[PDB]
Amino acid sequence: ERLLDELTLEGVARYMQSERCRRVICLVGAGISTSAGIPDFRSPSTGLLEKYHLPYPEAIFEISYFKKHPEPFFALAKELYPGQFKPTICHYFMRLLKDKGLLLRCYTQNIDTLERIAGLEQEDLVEAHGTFYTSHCVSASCRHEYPLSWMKEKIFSEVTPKCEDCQSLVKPDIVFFGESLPARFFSCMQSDFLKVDLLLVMGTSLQVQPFASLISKAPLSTPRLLINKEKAGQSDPFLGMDFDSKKAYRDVAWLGECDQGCLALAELLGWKKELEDLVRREHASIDAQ
Amino acid sequence: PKKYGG
Ligand SMILES: *C(=O)CCSCCCCCCCCCCCC
Ligand SMILES: [Zn+2]
């Protein structure tokens, strides 16, 4: 009846190497970048400011506040700026998917740019919450684009970034609270899920909407593999993924560190040496910058 | 559609 011959990582790998599995969508969250040292910016456990005299805590991340008082956000950005941008094994696993002609799209909730550094191109990515990779002047008639190196030196020198052409504020291309979500998120979702053969859901607790609803856009037959520290995505009994019931037929949970799960899957696929070689090479290159 | 906590 079902595409997976069994509801295990081993069944997923067999399916991936069969003729039926041509197009993979990855859905990724903060869990794939924590081993790179990037904290989960939506987790209350991370330290996300009395000196700023905010009308309410969340105002640091609302667009209309930021546009009037951008200094609190950029002071926070300095505190949190990563010491290094080194993608994880999981990011390079997706680069291997791309190399092998299997990656339809990576939808990411992360703003940390590590997908791009690892070699995913614009066409491969839906950055559902934007990115720090680029920044734009906020004036609608200007919209001059600035690269991350430019924005980095403003953040560290503690100079509020202003546009060289028009002297308006320049904002990192992340989606602030109160901003529209990207049109590309909705356009790609309407097309990609007609074509997907496998969903790889990695490092997300599937608690943030509308990103979490992407799992319900897959065709009914499409297997869904969760690689995550904790099971996630099941329907909420107070009001989905079905891993464990007698009716389960396509969803598989691999519980552990995302890097270790991708390593395990690569090893089943015969890709472990390729993945190790890519990661060691790219890490060596980043370390040598 | 706007970005929010949920
Ligand atoms: C929506 O869920 C995404 C926006 S939440 C904004 C949190 C940003 C605070 C820290 C960002 C600056 C430091 C990280 C830079 C990574 C290139
Ligand atoms: Zn400008």
The domains located in chain A, with CATH, are 1-34+88-128+183-289 (3.40.50.1220), 35-87+129-182 (3.30.1600.10)
d(CA A212, CA A234): 11
Would you tell me how many other CB atoms lie within 10 Å of the CB of residue A82? 15
d(CA A201, CA A218): 12
Residue among A208, A213, A239 with most chain B CBs within 10 A, to mutate: A208
Interface contact B2-A176, CB threshold 8 A = no
Alpha carbon of residue A211 to chain centroid: 10
Count how many residues are written for chain A: 289
State this model's resolution in angstroms.
1.6
Catalytic: A136? no
Radius of gyration in angstroms for the set of CA atoms belonging to chain B, rounded to a whole number: 5
- Measure A134 CA to ligand 2 centroid, in angstroms: 14
Burial A53-75 (b: 16+ CB within 10 A, else e): eeeeeebbbbbebbeeebebbbb
Taking the C-alpha atoms of A282, A172, A70 and A178 in order, what is their torsion angle to the nearest 10 degrees? -120
Q: How was this structure determined?
A: X-ray
Both tokens assigned to A18: 């069969």
Out of A58, A178, A208, the one facing B2 most closely (by C-beta) is: A178
**Ligand 1 proximity of A61 Cβ (cutoff 6 Å):** yes
**B2: chain A residues, CB-CB within 8 Å:** 178-181
What does the H/E/C string look like for chain A?
Answer: CCCCCCCCHHHHHHHHCCCCCCCEEEEECHHHCHHHCCCCCCCCCCCCCHHHCCCCHHHHHEHHHHHHCCHHHHHHHHHHCCCCCCCCHHHHHHHHHHHCCCEEEEEECCCCCHHHHCCCCHHHEEECCEEEEEEEECCCCCCCEEEHHHHHHHHHHCCCCECCCCCCEEEEEECCECCECCHHHHHHHHHHCCCCCEEEEECCCCCCCCHHHHHHHCCCCCCEEEEECCCCCECCCCCCECCCCCCCCCEEEEECCHHHHHHHHHHHHCCHHHHHHHHHHHHHHHHCC
